[PDB]
């Protein structure tokens, strides 16, 4: 959709993979504020907001914290902190037509600058003059919106750019959004370190006879010692035995 009517999707309770974002090369900008792109899969996020729109290339500088411009002032405002990433890629082939692509519009005129993360879908005629406008278009009455007018041949600056903004609302609230944690192969009867289910430990892993149900993830015994656990990848229960040690 257009920049003034920017689409918002609420994203939560998922395994948020960002490897696809890294792998693709068609993208132009991965500008991230308050967060490291390589560690997106590492942290857990309370909630994600996906803002999708299409902008002019020369205006991609206005999608940034503490920035000013017609798009920034009247179309889309980004907070100064904004722990999140703006990802923009050129879309000249997809979003330009023979003649003019007038389907996409931006708001020329507005009474005041909109607050961060505010959407103004109003189509009321703006009164630039002293005389009351009363819903007509005149010398000082102007339609707020105006089309991009994309052509097949256009300057890089004036060619369309598809932009997606990620509003990562960090909070102590339940972490709905978490990156993939990756995994490793299992190891048979040998003294190894392990981090099953987040439980760090050292020992040998043996196939066991202890049995239980999904009411459990990991096992223990007397004196609060972990001596069994099911691996998440196989749901197989293994005894943890301390690595061989003793005096000499």
């Amino acid at each position: 959709a257009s920049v003034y009517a920017w689409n918002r999707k609420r994203i939560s309770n998922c395994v948020a993979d960002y490897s696809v974002l890294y792998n693709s090369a068609s993208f132009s900008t991965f500008k991230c504020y308050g967060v490291s792109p390589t560690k997106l899969n590492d942290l857990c996020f309370t909630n994600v907001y996906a803002d999708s729109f299409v902008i002019r290339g020369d205006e991609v500088r206005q999608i940034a914290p503490g920035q000013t411009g017609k798009i920034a002032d009247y179309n889309y405002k980004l907070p100064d902190d904004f722990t999140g990433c703006v990802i923009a890629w050129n879309s000249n082939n997809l979003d330009s037509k023979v003649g003019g692509n007038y389907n996409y519009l931006y708001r020329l005129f507005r009474k005041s600058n909109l607050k961060p993360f505010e959407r103004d879908i109003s189509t009321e005629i703006y009164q630039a003059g002293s005389t009351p406008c009363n819903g007509v278009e005149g010398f000082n009455c102007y339609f707020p919106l105006q089309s991009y007018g994309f052509q097949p041949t256009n300057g890089v600056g004036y060619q369309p750019y598809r932009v997606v903004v990620l509003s990562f609302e960090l909070l102590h609230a339940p972490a709905t959004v978490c990156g993939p944690k990756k995994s490793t192969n299992l190891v048979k009867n040998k003294c190894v370190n392990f981090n099953f289910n987040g439980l760090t430990g050292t020992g040998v892993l043996t196939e066991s006879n202890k049995k239980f149900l999904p009411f459990q993830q990991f096992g223990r015994d007397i004196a609060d010692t972990t001596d069994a656990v099911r691996d998440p990848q196989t749901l197989e229960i293994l005894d943890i035995t301390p690595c061989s040690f003793g005096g000499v």
């Epitope: 020329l108 005129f109 005629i125 005389t131 819903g135 007509v136 278009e137 010398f139």
Partner: antibody, heavy 117, light 111 residues
Framework: VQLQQSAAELARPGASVKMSCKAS????????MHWVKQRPGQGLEWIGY????????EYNQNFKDKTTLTADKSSSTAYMQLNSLTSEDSAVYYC???????????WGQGTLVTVSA | IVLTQSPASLAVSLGQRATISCRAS??????????MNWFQQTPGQPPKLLIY???NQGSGVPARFSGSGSGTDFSLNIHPMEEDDTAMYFC?????????FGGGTKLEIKR
């Protein structure tokens, strides 16, 4: 958005001419409307405009006295009144609609008015 | 505001650049944007909106037409000139109440 005017009216000097411009394809209530003259083989000169909803007309100093600008929202049309016609008034006139930040944005055909005895 | 239109009668061959220049007594840019407007009129037809603003192209306008400029200086570039381009081209200023047009340029195919 289409504009249909009258056709080639003939008047003697000293008479009065009332002529019409109907507009279709749009509201006709949300756009101010402009009038333009053009003498044969000459430049284009704007006369004046009106807001259809409120009877506010603005004319040039040149055309303030002799020109009268009216509109009818019920029939969605426009009317020109020319009084005390002279030889210089013989020309082709153009009916213009507001749009795209332009005063005379959309132009409709034209009326050839000839003032001679 | 008075508009002066340099060359107002230009003849170039088909497929060649056709440039018409427009200047104003005062500045044409207001509210950031530019209020220079560009029209085309063929014989027997009323003028049509072609270029609104300094650079933005009008509805039903080929990519051949290109308007550019700022302040008081504006230009029309016509690189792939076609047969239909033979017409009279006009300037317009929209900031002030008195609407004044340019000189008017009749474009003809050169042979």
């Amino acid at each position: 958005v289409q504009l249909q005017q009258s056709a080639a009216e003939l008047a003697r000097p000293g008479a009065s001419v009332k002529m019409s411009c109907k507009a279709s394809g749009y509201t006709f209530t949300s756009y101010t409307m402009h009038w333009v003259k053009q003498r044969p083989g000459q430049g284009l000169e704007w006369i004046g405009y009106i807001n259809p909803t409120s009877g506010y007309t603005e004319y040039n100093q040149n055309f303030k006295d002799k020109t009268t600008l009216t509109a009818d929202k019920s029939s969605s049309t426009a009317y020109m009144q020319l009084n005390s016609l002279t030889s210089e008034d013989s020309a082709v006139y153009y009916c213009a609609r507001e749009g795209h930040r332009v005063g005379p944005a959309y132009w409709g055909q034209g009326t050839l008015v000839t003032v001679s005895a | 505001i008075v508009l002066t239109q340099s060359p107002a009668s230009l003849a170039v061959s088909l497929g060649q650049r056709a440039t018409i220049s427009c200047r104003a007594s005062e500045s044409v840019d207001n509210y950031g944007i530019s209020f220079m407007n560009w029209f085309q009129q063929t014989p027997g037809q009323p003028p049509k909106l072609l270029i609104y603003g300094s650079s933005n192209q009008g509805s039903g306008v080929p990519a051949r037409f290109s308007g550019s400029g700022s302040g008081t200086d504006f230009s029309l570039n016509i690189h792939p000139m076609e047969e239909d381009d033979t017409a009279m081209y006009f300037c317009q200023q929209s900031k002030e109440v008195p609407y004044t047009f340019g000189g008017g340029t009749k474009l003809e195919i050169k042979r």
